[PDB]
Structures are given as structure tokens and as C-alpha cells.
From Swiss-Prot, chain B:
It comes from Homo sapiens (Human). Residues 1-24 are annotated as: Disordered. This is Small ribosomal subunit protein eS32. Initially thought to be part of the large ribosomal subunit. Crystal structures show eS32/eL41 to be a small ribosomal subunit forming a bridge at the interface of the 2 subunits. Component of the small ribosomal subunit. The ribosome is a large ribonucleoprotein complex responsible for the synthesis of proteins in the cell. Interacts with the beta subunit of protein kinase CKII and stimulates phosphorylation of DNA topoisomerase II alpha by CKII. The keyword tRNA-binding does not apply. The gene is RPL41. Keywords: Cytoplasm, Ribonucleoprotein, Ribosomal protein. Coiled coil: none annotated. One of its GO terms (biological process) is translation.
UniProtKB/Swiss-Prot annotation, chain E:
Residues 1-15 have a biased composition (Basic and acidic residues). PROSITE patterns: RIBOSOMAL_S27E (PS01168). This is Small ribosomal subunit protein eS27. It comes from the Eukaryota.
Swiss-Prot record, chain F:
One of its GO terms (biological process) is erythrocyte homeostasis. This is Small ribosomal subunit protein eS17. It is found in: Cytoplasm; Nucleus, Nucleolus. Component of the small ribosomal subunit. Part of the small subunit (SSU) processome, composed of more than 70 proteins and the RNA chaperone small nucleolar RNA (snoRNA) U3. PROSITE patterns: RIBOSOMAL_S17E. NCBIfam families: PRK01151.1. It comes from the Eukaryota. It comes from Homo sapiens (Human). InterPro entries: Ribosomal_eS17, Ribosomal_eS17_CS, Ribosomal_eS17_sf.
Curated annotation (Swiss-Prot), chain I:
Its main location: cytoplasm. The lineage of its organism: Eukaryota, Metazoa, Chordata, Craniata, Vertebrata. One of its GO terms (molecular function) is structural constituent of ribosome. Belongs to the eukaryotic ribosomal protein eS21 family. This is Small ribosomal subunit protein eS21. GO terms for cellular component: cytoplasm; cytosol; cytosolic ribosome; cytosolic small ribosomal subunit; endoplasmic reticulum; nucleoplasm; rough endoplasmic reticulum; small ribosomal subunit.
RNA sequence: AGGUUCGAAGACGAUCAGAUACCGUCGUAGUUCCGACCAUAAACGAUGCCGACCGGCGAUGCGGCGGCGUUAUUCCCAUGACCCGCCGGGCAGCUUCCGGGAAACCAAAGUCUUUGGGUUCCGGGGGGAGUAUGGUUGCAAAGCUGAAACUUAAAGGAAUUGACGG
């Protein structure tokens, strides 16, 4: 995103800070060092928000380059991210893989879950190590999310990020879906997207049973 | 046979041979 | 590692002829002990007189009486 | 076939290590090679802690502890089941076994 | 990183590098103006002084040589020399 | 004890749930009757063993998803889970806890000096590592 | 009677991919043996290299399986080597032929000197390795033939190498490692960078994105 | 100790090239090293290079273009005549189509094709292809 | 290829990695070819034409396919210089 | 010289079919010190030395250079005890499809058919045999150097499966 229309907005800066994308971990990977801005006195590495915006746009231009929207496949094995990838594919027309990624999905053609994608998207290189490894057998370019300590072994468009925070992950998928839609012919670049970013947030089952009844109590009162 | 005890047996045989040569 | 210097030909040649004594074929063909010990004395064939007819048992897996002569 | 990278002993920069005696058989074992189990035992067993405390003239006494450091050769350690054989991959794990305290 | 710009490294890592392992060698030491108390003149002391430098006019010692760098006595103001 | 279902009865029970979901219900006897014609089972014992596990499964799936799959069960449960629809987003905080180093990064970006943001006191002590060694 | 399961097989079947080199260009793995016999039709000559009876010691004395080595390829610049271990010799033969078909690579041919006609030898001296076996192919002048052991000789003849010197090292008696080393050396003839290949590459569309409009309607 | 600066330069270039790096730094710079780099760069096997001048023996930064298979050296600088330059070509070069042997002649440091063209032999330095 | 008669005697010309210039072999299944859809200036929508990059298996396996792609896009203007 | 303990040899008591042993009780030489010999160990990292290059990470020992802070005393700094880093030299460790290797494994055992940085020692199927003989060293025990005849189709290394284990 080298253009004025593809420039970060103040509201997007606020969303990034609120979610916690700028925050990282206490461990630095030598291949993620370029995206790191500075390490605070707490030890948490701080991530250049300008650089994650550029990598987010780079991944967006990569995704929209594929004519078949379902050719790209979004994979998230961690509970902080099934909802994000499911809603991502629901908006962008992609193909989601929520939960465990069974081995042999890309290499073994016998099982019914076998598929032939043209692009792979990962929430965590550490958690989703298996789909990344199988991407190396099938000529599969990968956009993957990141961490300050993530291994970039088969990662190409690693967007600097905080993949541990539930709010950060949901926002990361939200802006990725927003940007691919926006540079496609679905959003006219002017008005804010009608989709609220919290739609992709994964809420724990510890409160999924009590928030709806407390909401009903608030509505009647 | 254990190599160490084969070595020890060999030393006995060498000492016997030196005894016989000195005798002549 | 082996020396590759431009003026090491003496050491290379001396080491070769020193180490050549460590293989059986060169040692037996140049020491002369094998030639002396050979009953034929380096000859392909040799004539003799049959002292007696003898029979020799075969090795362990086989079982036969090989027919030989002491000559 | 080198079984262990460290040859079963914690000697890296040394030439020689003074030996010790196994507390079970008096085997001369290098100190860096022997199995050291430092036990903190109760002076009185858990069945008789009550009887000693009841008979104690003091209103609040704390029973002492035996601090004995034990040195084992690997043969007495294995025979006494202090250490066990492990898999090829399991042998490379140097963390102490869990205490199972709760 | 395959495409590190060896020819033009930024100053911070050059300062971080060892003096001989810099792209061009540069001594870490420096000369500095040292003003001993109770005098007027300015004497030059090596930052890695190995001998006890003596303020000539004023009696008190200036720097006690230690392992790496000179140990300036209290009250001794020092200024750098052309970086 | 000893009531574990074989993979034969289990897989057969799953399969008929996959294909015939509307035809089946919560009642055991009705499920065993529909099992007569949606599938052929040479054994009566297998017939009501399969039907028994079908009612057990359908009771479980009436309130959640299992390793069985229905194409309808995917789509209406994704139509559901709309959102908690909070009146406002959770990321529109009026004030954001921002480190002074972070604000320095933001002004380098040039998006600093926002009235929404407020700087926080930097932590002092620099002791973030855990004590090395056991305890 | 061939229903392709892969996207690539579908494109080959419906005449969308016009050459096997089109797949080789984008390095797409071949997962169906019926993909390539459509291209190299009736030109692949099959030879069995060895049937070795591997044994596994059980309580029942031993159990026996047969490992079949198969070299295949038209004598024009394609060669493949396949290994299959199976209980039956016939099943191992069919499995090894399928695997050899799948692992078919193109063979680069050059000239020993003074390039006049068609290329005949290896473009440069190459080295393949497997186990301890080190096999080195060496360019040879026109007419010298293929001087080698019989196992790499038939492998190179199928590759289409008319002239080649070879040098082998290690336990060449191990036929599997000897054939794999030769096949490895043959495969890396294109992987070797050469001044005539120094020219910058122009990129074309992969068959997936070139026929993605066709894949949605046929191979749904 | 370091007894062949050209050998260390060529081995460093080879290791960085195999590693895939865009640049390589050679710590000891020499006239022989610079001439060797010049004949490699003229043939196109490397890019531009810089000579960092310290008052000691300088350094060199070479721009690798990713088209160098091997740049070995022949440390004992054997006397290669023209009648046996063909044997060295067969022993060292990967083919008769490309590849070069660098040998210092009385007309300067040059490749074997140029040495044959002006009919001069010399001491073999190394090879690259 | 291209003997002195002029005809291209080769059955195909392999691609080369746009980051390390190595030949991408026909059995290199870790190598990729990816496209970045460049946008237009006035509205930032995809304009049909895109930009192609290729990464070989070795570069994409040692972990530096990410940095290589970033550098290629930076050189081609997809990524602005202020990165 | 001194001999506390331990303890070759030895004795006795056990055990066993036997037990010249393993177990127990004594116990000589020795174990200790000084001097004079000997020059050998699985003297091991079973892994030459010097030099160059080629991944990452967290520690640790020494020295040095920086920096939030807590602590020691006093009135400030040093200066010590910690804390966060950097550099160099070390003992190492974890991880890695750098690469190697027969593999076990090794950031060296890598940079090797794409074979050459410098230079020592040293191996050539298994036995006979580290024997015979000669020379030399030693008070001796023995050390260093060191064959041949003859004999043999395998001996070995690493991994795999099984079988077995007091
Ligand atoms: Mg020792
Ligand atoms: Mg006693
Ligand atoms: Mg040397
Ligand atoms: Mg021998
Ligand atoms: Zn013991």
C-alpha cells in the first residue's frame, strides 16, 4: 500500500491499539526482527504499526490476485481463531478449516477431505505447523500470521501482529477481510464497513451461556 | 579369552623363552 | 591432511614407498620370502615322483574323500 | 555406539575428578558420575509423630529432620530402583521427575 | 538476512561491533581535557590511562589506572576532544 | 459393565443420521422402525442396537455439534452465532493505555497526538524474567 | 475410463494442458499415473531391474516380501525410476511401474563440443548420490556410446543420453542405491545453472490460474 | 596461520554463494584477489565489488549475482604450459562449453581462453564455473 | 540450448528463483510462484494486471521467503519506501 | 622414615557337587613422606595443530563497555550485591531439511567426483602377532623398534525386525 488511498487511518490506529496488535512477546525471532520497532522496559517487544499495515496490504493484494475466491483456504486450529476464519470465509468466499487440520489433506488424495487450494492462510505458525509443512509438498504459497517468536520456515507474507490476543486476532482477520473486499468490487472505499469487527471475536464458552441471559435481563429492565 | 589375560599368559611364555635361551 | 607443497616431492615419494610395504601383494612380491617358501620356486609347473597315494577328508559342510598323492 | 553424549557423567572441562564411595556398596565412583540423592527425612516416622509430640514436655516442639546426602554407583542406583531405564528419546530429558506433592 | 547492506551499515551496529571487526577499524578510546581542582591549566589524559597522571601544579592525583578505563577522581571535570 | 458399542454399530448409526435426519426422532421405538427400511440389517439384535445408539446420538446433537455432520446443521448454526451484538464495538475505547515508547512509535508514524490516547507511567524495575533454575 | 481426482488430472484429460513440460515448468507434483501416459503414449518402455526378496523376522521364522525396481521412459528425454515392496511379485511390479511413471523427470541434453546436430550427451558433468553410492556422469563426444555398468547404462539409454562416460564409487552392488544415484544425477541436469540459462525468466500463468474458469464448472 | 589470501577469499565467496546471500565480505584484500575478481566479473560470474581502504590490507565487498556454481582455488601454483593446459581443462572445468581456469601469465592474470589466444602459459591460480 | 544453427534445442526452459537466481527444478515441490495484484491510483481497486514472483524451495525452507518477497515488492513499488 | 585406615599375597570361617572366588574375620607387600628409577592406562572427546568461512536461541566463567531501577554505608560520587544489554576469549547446552555421513550422530565429524588453505603422525581383509629375531633402554618387571612361515572366507561397523533375560 504505497498510495494515498491505501494509507492507514487514525481510526485504524485506534483499533490496532485497542486490540493490542502493537504488543508482542518477550522473545524475538531473528527473522521477525525487521518488523520489531523497539523493546520496552517491560520486555514486551513493540511492533511497528506502519509495517504491519504494509504486510496486511501485501497479503490483501496476494489474495485478490486469485480468480477463484474459494481457492484460498483459511486454517486456525486454536480456539482464538475458529470464529475469525469461519466469518472470514463467509465474507470473502474462501474455504475455512476450523479446528484440527487432519494430516494428508493436501498430500493424500484418498480421503474425502482432500483439497487442492491455491493459497493458504494461517493463524499461528506454532499451532498450525502441520498445514504449513504440507504446503511445502504441494506448491502452496502461504500468508501466515505471526508473533515476535514465530518460526517463519515456510512463511512468505508474515504480517507482524499479536496472534495470542483474542481481540488482536479477530481484528487482524477483520481488516484482512475488509481490505480484500475493499480492493475487490464490493466496498466503495468511502463509508465504513457495515460489518462490526467484534463479529470475528471469539468469546469463551465461560461467558457464552451467561451474556445472553444478562442481555435479556437488561433488555426487560 | 579375555585379551588382558591373554597378554598375561603371553608374558609368562616370553619369560620362559628368555630362561631357556639364557640356559644355552 | 597430506602435504601439497611445491617442493614436497621427496616426502611424497618416500611416504609412498614406505607405505607400499603395508599391503600383502607388494610385500610378497618384493621381500622374497614367498619366493623362497614356494615349493615350485616361482615355476608354473614342476615334475616329481609319486611317493604314495593318499586320501584327504573334505571340510566341515561337505563330506568326501579327495584323492591326492604325496609327491 | 556412544550411548550418551556426556558419557554418563557431568565432566566437560576437567581432566580428572576425585572419586567417592557408594553409600550402599562402597564402590569407587567418580563424583561427577555418581547419582546424588539428597534426602530430607523426618527424624520420627509419620506413624509415631503423634506419640512423640504427645509425650513431648514442650507445648510446641518441631520434630527435626535428617539431612543425609546419598551417593550411588549406577549399579546400586538401578538395583534400588532410584533410576530406571528410559527410551532413546526419554534419556535426553534432564528435568527432575515431578514430586507429585498434591 | 541475505541482502544486508554490508557497504553502508548504520552507525549503531558499527558502534556495537568489536573495534577490529568494524568495517574500518576505529579505536574506542579517546583523549579528553581534564581540569584538576585548584589550578588553571588543562592537561590531557588518555581515556584508557595505564599510569597515574599527575596534575603538575595541583598536588592531588587525577586518574587511578584500572582494568579498562581511567578512574577520574571526584571534582575533575572532563571534556571530549573532537569526538 | 460391558456395554461398549462396536465400530460396526457406531458407524452404521452415524451414517443413517447423516442421510436420514428429518425422518428420525427422539423416540427409540420409532427410530428402530425407520431403521427397518432406510437400511437393511439382517440381525434384529443389530437393528435395535443401532437404533439405540441413534437415539443416544440424536439426543446429544439436539443441543450441540458432534463428530457427525449435517449440511443443514452447518448452515443454520452459522446463520445463528450472529453476534452478541454489543451496542458499541469493544475496540472504540475512550482512553487507551499507551506506553510512552508506543506513543514515540505513533509520532514516528505521524499518527500521534490523539486526544483519545493517554500515556501511562512506565514500569520501573526491569525485572521481568523468571528466576532461572528450579524455583 | 479415467476419472481424475486432482485438478491437474482434470486439465490433462480435457486437453487443456498441451505438454508435459508445461507441468514441469511449474514443478507441479504428479499424483495420477494416468496423467502422463496421455502425453507419452506407447513410448514408455518398461524394464525390471531387480526383484529382491526382503525378509522380516517374526515368530513364524520369517515373512517374505518382494521389492521391485522399475526403470521406465521414452528414449527421448524422459526417465523414471520406481521402487515398490509388496507381498506378491506381480503386485510389486505393477506398483513399481506406477511409481516410476509418477517420478518421471525431464533429461537435459547438451554437447561435448562444437554443437552441430541434436544434443547427445549430458550438458555438464553431474553427480548423483544415494547411500554410499556416488555416480558421476561425464560428457562424451559423439559416437562413444554409454560406458557404464549395466544398471546405469539402461537408465541412461531410457533417458536418451547417447554418449556418456561414467565413474562410480561405493557399494555399487547395491542395485537400489546404484539406480537411485544414477537417477539423481540424471534429474539434476536441469537443476545445474549454465551461462545459456543466465537469461532472466519471463513468467507465464500457472495452469491453475489459467484454467480456473474451467475448473469451477467441470472439476467442482 | 593464514598462508593463502586468495584461497580464503574464494572459499568465503563460495560459502556465501551456496548460502544464497546477496553480498560477501573478504577481510584480506590483495592485488591477486582483485585481478581474480575482475576476470570473474568480466565474464559475468559476479557483480560489482568495492575495495574498502583501511591503511592495512583492505577489505572487499562483492555483489553476488547468484550464478556462481564453484570458485575454487588451486593452492600449489603449478607450472602449466600450453601442451598440458588441455589436461587441466578436462580435470577442472565441468564441461567444454563453459567454465574458466584462471592462471597468472607474464601478460597478466587471465583466463585460459585468453591465455591460449595470446599463446602464453604460467602458474595456475584457480577456477570458476 | 541454441546450437550454432540457431534453433532452440531444449524441451523446456526452467524458471529461476526471483530471490536467489537458482534453477527451480521440476521436482522442487517446496518452491512456489505467487502473484501480487497491483491496484490503480485513484481508487485502489484491482486493475486486472498483477506481478509475479517465484521462490525456490531452499530459500522458502531456510525461512527467508518472507524477507525476499518483501524486498521484491519494495523494489517494484508495491511496498512504499518508508517501510 | 612412618605405619591410622584400607588392603594384593596368605590363613581361617562361610557358600557350593567342587569354590584355589564372589561374603565375613584377621592380615604381608603396598597404600603416606623424602630421594632415585620405570614410561605405561578405555593416558578417551576412542575424535592432530594453526588459519578462513558457513544458522538461530537461552544460559554460565572471566575481563571490559554501557544503561531503568533496588540494596551497603554517609555527606555526593564511585565502589561492591542484584537488574537490562553489548564486545571478546572460554566450559558447555537446546534447536535446525547449512551441510555431511553407512548410520548412530556431528554446527563439526560441515564448506569433498562442484575432489588442492599449511603441515605432522598414522591404517591397508581376519589370524599368526605386538609373536620370533636383531638393536637399544632398565636393578628387575618390562619399555621402544619389529617380521616371516603358515592358516583362513570372512572377521568387523551402524541400524532393523524377531526371540530371549536370574
Ligand atoms: Mg584421565
Ligand atoms: Mg583389616
Ligand atoms: Mg596443515
Ligand atoms: Mg592386515
Ligand atoms: Zn553401589
Amino acid at each position: 500500500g504505497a498510495l494515498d488511498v491505501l494509507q492507514m487511518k487514525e481510526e485504524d490506529v485506534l483499533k490496532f491499539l485497542a486490540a493490542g496488535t502493537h504488543l508482542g512477546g518477550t522473545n524475538l525471532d531473528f527473522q521477525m526482527e525487521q518488523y520489531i520497532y523497539k523493546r520496552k522496559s517491560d520486555g514486551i517487544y513493540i511492533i511497528n504499526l506502519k509495517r504491519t499495515w504494509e504486510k496486511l496490504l501485501l497479503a490483501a493484494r496476494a489474495i485478490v490476485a486469485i480468480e477463484n475466491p474459494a481457492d484460498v483456504s483459511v486454517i486456525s486450529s486454536r480456539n482464538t481463531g475458529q470464529r475469525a476464519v469461519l466469518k472470514f470465509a463467509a465474507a470473502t468466499g474462501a474455504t475455512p478449516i476450523a479446528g484440527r487440520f487432519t494430516p494428508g489433506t493436501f498430500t493424500n488424495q484418498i480421503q474425502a477431505a482432500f483439497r487442492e487450494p491455491r493459497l493458504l492462510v494461517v493463524t499461528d505458525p506454532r499451532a498450525d505447523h502441520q498445514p504449513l509443512t504440507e504446503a511445502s509438498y504441494v506448491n502452496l504459497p502461504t500468508i501466515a500470521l505471526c508473533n515476535t517468536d514465530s518460526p517463519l520456515r515456510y512463511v512468505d507474507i508474515a504480517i507482524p501482529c499479536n496472534n495470542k490476543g483474542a481481540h488482536s486476532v479477530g481484528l487482524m482477520w477483520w481488516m484482512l477481510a475488509r481490505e480484500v473486499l475493499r480492493m475487490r468490487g464490493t466496498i466503495s472505499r468511502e463509508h465504513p464497513w457495515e460489518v462490526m469487527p467484534d463479529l470475528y471475536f471469539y468469546r469463551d464458552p465461560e461467558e457464552i451461556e451467561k451474556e445472553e441471559q444478562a442481555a435479556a435481563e437488561k433488555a426487560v429492565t | 579369552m579375555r585379551a588382558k589375560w591373554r597378554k598375561k599368559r603371553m608374558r609368562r611364555l616370553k619369560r620362559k623363552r628368555r630362561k631357556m635361551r639364557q640356559r644355552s | 591432511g597430506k602435504c601439497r607443497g611445491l617442493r614436497t616431492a621427496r616426502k611424497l615419494r618416500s611416504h609412498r614407498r614406505d607405505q607400499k610395504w603395508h599391503d600383502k601383494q607388494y610385500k610378497k612380491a618384493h621381500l622374497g620370502t614367498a619366493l623362497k617358501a614356494n615349493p615350485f620356486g616361482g615355476a608354473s609347473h614342476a615334475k616329481g615322483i609319486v611317493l604314495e597315494k593318499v586320501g584327504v577328508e573334505a571340510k566341515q559342510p561337505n563330506s568326501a574323500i579327495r584323492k591326492c598323492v604325496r609327491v | 555406539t556412544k550411548k550418551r553424549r556426556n558419557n554418563g557423567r557431568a565432566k566437560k572441562g576437567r581432566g580428572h575428578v576425585q572419586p567417592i564411595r557408594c553409600t550402599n556398596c562402597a564402590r569407587c565412583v567418580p563424583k561427577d558420575k555418581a547419582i546424588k540423592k539428597f534426602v530430607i527425612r523426618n527424624i520420627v516416622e509419620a506413624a509415631a509423630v503423634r506419640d512423640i509430640s504427645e509425650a513431648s514436655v514442650f507445648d510446641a516442639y518441631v520434630l527435626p529432620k535428617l539431612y543425609v546426602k546419598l551417593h550411588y554407583c549406577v549399579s546400586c542406583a538401578i538395583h534400588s530402583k532410584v533410576v530406571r531405564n528410559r527410551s532413546r528419546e526419554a534419556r535426553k530429558d534432564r528435568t527432575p521427575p515431578p514430586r507429585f506433592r498434591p | 538476512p541475505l541482502a544486508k547492506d554490508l557497504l553502508h551499515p548504520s552507525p549503531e551496529e558499527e558502534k556495537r561491533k568489536h573495534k577490529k571487526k568494524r568495517l574500518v577499524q576505529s579505536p574506542n578510546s579517546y583523549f579528553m581535557d581534564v581540569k584538576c581542582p585548584g589550578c588553571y591549566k588543562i592537561t590531557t589524559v588518555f581515556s584508557h590511562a595505564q599510569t597515574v597522571v599527575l596534575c603538575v601544579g595541583c598536588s592531588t592525583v587525577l586518574c587511578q589506572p584500572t582494568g579498562g578505563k581511567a578512574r577520574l577522581t571526584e571534582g575533575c571535570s572532563f571534556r571530549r576532544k573532537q569526538h | 459393565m460391558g456395554r461398549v458399542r462396536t465400530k460396526t454399530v457406531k458407524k452404521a448409526a452415524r451414517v443413517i443420521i447423516e442421510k436420514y435426519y428429518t425422518r428420525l426422532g427422539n423416540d427409540f421405538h420409532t427410530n428402530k422402525r425407520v431403521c427397518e427400511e432406510i437400511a437393511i440389517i439382517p440381525s434384529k439384535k443389530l437393528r435395535n442396537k443401532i437404533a439405540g445408539y441413534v437415539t443416544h446420538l440424536m439426543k446429544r446433537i439436539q443441543r450441540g455439534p458432534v463428530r457427525g455432520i449435517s449440511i443443514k446443521l452447518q448452515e443454520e448454526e452459522r446463520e445463528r452465532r450472529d453476534n452478541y451484538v454489543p451496542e458499541v464495538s469493544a475496540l472504540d475505547q475512550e482512553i487507551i493505555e499507551v506506553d510512552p515508547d508506543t506513543k514515540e512509535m505513533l509520532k514516528l508514524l505521524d499518527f500521534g497526538s490523539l486526544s483519545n490516547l493517554q500515556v501511562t507511567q512506565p514500569t520501573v524495575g526491569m525485572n521481568f524474567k523468571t528466576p532461572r533454575g528450579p524455583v | 475410463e479415467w476419472m481424475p481426482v486432482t485438478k491437474l488430472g482434470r486439465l490433462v484429460k480435457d486437453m487443456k494442458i498441451k505438454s508435459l513440460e508445461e507441468i514441469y515448468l511449474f514443478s507441479l507434483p504428479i499424483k495420477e499415473s494416468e496423467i502422463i501416459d496421455f502425453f507419452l503414449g506407447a513410448s514408455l518402455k518398461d524394464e525390471v531391474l531387480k526383484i529382491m526378496p526382503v525378509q522380516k523376522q517374526t515368530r513364524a521364522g520369517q515373512r517374505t516380501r518382494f521389492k521391485a525396481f522399475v526403470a521406465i521412459g521414452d528414449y527421448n528425454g524422459h526417465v523414471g525410476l520406481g521402487v515398490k515392496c509388496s507381498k506378491e511379485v506381480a503386485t510389486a511390479i505393477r506398483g513399481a511401474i506406477i511409481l516410476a511413471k509418477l517420478s518421471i523427470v525431464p533429461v537435459r541434453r547438451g554437447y561435448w563440443g562444437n554443437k552441430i546436430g541434436k544434443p547427445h550427451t549430458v550438458p555438464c558433468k553431474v553427480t548423483g548420490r544415494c547411500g554410499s553410492v556416488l555416480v558421476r556422469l561425464i560428457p562424451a563426444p559423439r559416437g562413444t556410446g554409454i560406458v557404464s555398468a549395466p544398471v546405469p547404462k539402461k537408465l541412461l539409454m531410457m533417458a536418451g543420453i547417447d554418449d556418456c562416460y561414467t565413474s562410480a564409487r561405493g557399494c555399487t552392488a547395491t542395485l537400489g542405491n546404484f539406480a537411485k544415484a544414477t537417477f539423481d544425477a540424471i534429474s539434476k541436469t536441469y537443476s545445474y545453472l549454465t551461462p545459456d540459462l543466465w537469461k532472466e525468466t519471463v513468467f507465464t500463468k500457472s495452469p491453475y490460474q489459467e484454467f480456473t474458469d474451467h475448473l469451477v464448472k467441470t472439476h467442482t | 596461520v593464514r598462508m593463502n589470501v586468495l584461497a580464503d577469499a574464494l572459499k568465503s565467496i563460495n560459502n556465501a554463494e551456496k548460502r544464497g546471500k546477496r553480498q560477501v565480505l573478504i577481510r584480506p584484500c590483495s592485488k591477486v584477489i582483485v585481478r581474480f575478481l575482475t576476470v570473474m566479473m568480466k565474464h559475468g560470474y559476479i557483480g560489482e565489488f568495492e575495495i574498502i581502504d583501511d591503511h592495512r590490507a583492505g577489505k572487499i565487498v562483492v555483489n553476488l549475482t547468484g550464478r556462481l556454481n564453484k570458485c575454487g582455488v588451486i593452492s600449489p601454483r603449478f607450472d602449466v604450459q600450453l601442451k598440458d593446459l588441455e589436461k587441466w581443462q578436462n580435470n577442472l572445468l565441468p564441461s567444454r562449453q563453459f567454465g574458466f581456469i584462471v592462471l597468472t601469465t607474464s601478460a597478466g592474470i587471465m583466463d585460459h581462453e585468453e591465455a591460449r589466444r595470446k599463446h602464453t602459459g604460467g602458474k595456475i591460480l584457480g577456477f570458476f564455473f | 540450448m541454441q546450437n550454432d544453427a540457431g534453433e532452440f534445442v531444449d524441451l523446456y526452459v526452467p524458471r529461476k528463483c526471483s530471490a536467489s537466481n537458482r534453477i527451480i527444478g521440476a521436482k522442487d515441490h517446496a518452491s512456489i510462484q505467487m502473484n501480487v495484484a497491483e491496484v490503480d491510483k485513484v481508487t485502489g481497486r484491482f486493475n486486472g494486471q498483477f506481478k509475479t514472483y517465484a521462490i525456490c524451495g531452499a530459500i522458502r525452507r531456510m525461512g527467508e521467503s518472507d524477507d525476499s518477497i518483501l524486498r521484491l515488492a519494495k523494489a517494484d513499488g508495491i511496498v512504499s519506501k518508508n517501510f
